[PDB]
Swiss-Prot record, chain B:
Keywords: Activator, Aromatic hydrocarbons catabolism, DNA-binding, Transcription, Transcription regulation
Binding site for benzoate 2: 18, 58, 74, 116, 207
Function: Positive regulator of the ben and cat genes for benzoate degradation. BenM is necessary for ben gene expression but not for expression of the cat genes, which can be regulated by CatM. Binds to the inducers cis,cis-muconate and benzoate.
Interval of the full protein contained in this chain: 87 to 304 of 304
Metal-binding found in the keyword field: no
Subunit organization: Homotetramer; dimer of dimers. The dimers can also associate to form linear, higher oligomers (in vitro).
Protein's recorded name: HTH-type transcriptional regulator BenM
Taxonomic lineage from the root: Bacteria, Pseudomonadati, Pseudomonadota, Gammaproteobacteria, Moraxellales
Length: 216, 223
């Protein structure tokens, strides 16, 4: 009678909480254990049975795991209000506008992680940011930006964090995205997981995202 | 030069409030200076100050050590983070008292070594002979807030945490006058350098803009 759900910390700023809340309303008799962990930990947790569902942001594929893309979330650039890039907030900027800026990557957790994903997007277009500095967590990066130490690339849902003189600029490159996946065991056929799928679908319909006909 | 390098330690929770704009203004007013910033707990800041790893530390705990001195900057109010549908959310505009929270599922944080915010919050309850039963320890503030938003319970948070806004997360005023969390600036127990006095001056400026009530002696003594 216990569902165990793993999730990367960055998903706390997006739709995940309202998904869990709606899921809990339909399941008073179920025990919802929420675990914060990275995609690499979730994969091992799924096989072993430590979690039943995993929400992550990278696609490290595995025979025993069925991962489904929920959506591609936009990346944005966090800048100080006075930064030149903040003059291009309405229309947006491109990745190649960022290469001579002091870029704050995060987290400092084991790789692969969000900083590896960010650096991969740059390297996918032959872009080479020379002024790079890795810090521990998202709020540290935003704090440092607000204090005037650089810029940071962040998921759009990070706008949940509003700091004094911190502005978020849209990125125009189509592939300036960070995906969100739900991962379950390849064999999975539980009514709890399918109801979780249903809950996610229900909320994605409320927001009105573009989804295939066979999606979940 | 190393002489023109100032190293500042701070606890993570202070990034949601006034600290960043204080550092930005300090940097702006002293382009001569290299400012280095280190996130670390109040306990770590003590040894850092002693060995010269940092020159000033911003923290929320008074940990007495003869090698260190401090100044209280202000007492920040606490608030209760709740789900928008929670009964306590009816008091969002008026506020609630600590004894209203006793039978609630309270998410404490962080899960780092003690003493910390969880222990200080628990001390506030015990100071009034209140013993919350449903207590849960969680790693960090956004996990606590995310879980609150998921419907797991409530959490006591510094008021500047309101920088984080989540769907169906609401912040309720906590009315008890001692439901506060202090903010200190600690330095070596010696005469502050001119660079640290200049940091004091920046703090005074920002605090004047915010209208906080000090203390005639507060952060004074350049000469
Ligand atoms: Cl306050």
């Amino acid at each position: 009678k216990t569902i165990r759900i793993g999730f990367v910390g960055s998903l706390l700023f997006g739709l995940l909480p309202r998904i869990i809340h709606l899921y809990r309303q339909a399941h008073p008799n179920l025990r919802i254990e929420l675990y914060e962990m990275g995609t690499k930990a979730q994969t091992e947790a799924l096989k072993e049975g430590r979690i039943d569902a995993g929400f992550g942001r990278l696609k490290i594929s595995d025979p025993a795991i069925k991962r489904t893309l929920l959506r591609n979330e936009r990346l944005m650039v966090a800048v100080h209000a006075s930064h030149p890039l903040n003059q291009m907030k309405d229309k947006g900027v491109h990745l190649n506008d960022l290469i001579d800026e002091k870029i704050l990557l995060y987290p400092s957790s084991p790789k692969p992680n969000f900083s590896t994903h960010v650096m991969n997007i740059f390297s996918d277009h032959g872009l080479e940011p020379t002024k790079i500095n890795e810090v521990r967590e998202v709020q540290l990066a935003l704090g440092l930006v607000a204090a005037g130490e650089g810029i940071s690339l962040v998921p759009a849902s990070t706008q949940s964090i509003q700091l004094f003189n911190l502005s978020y600029v849209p990125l125009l490159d189509p592939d300036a995205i960070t995906p969100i996946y739900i991962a379950v065991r390849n064999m999975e056929e539980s009514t709890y997981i399918y109801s979780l799928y249903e809950t996610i679908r229900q909320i994605y319909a409320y927001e009105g995202f573009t989804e295939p006909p066979n999606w979940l």
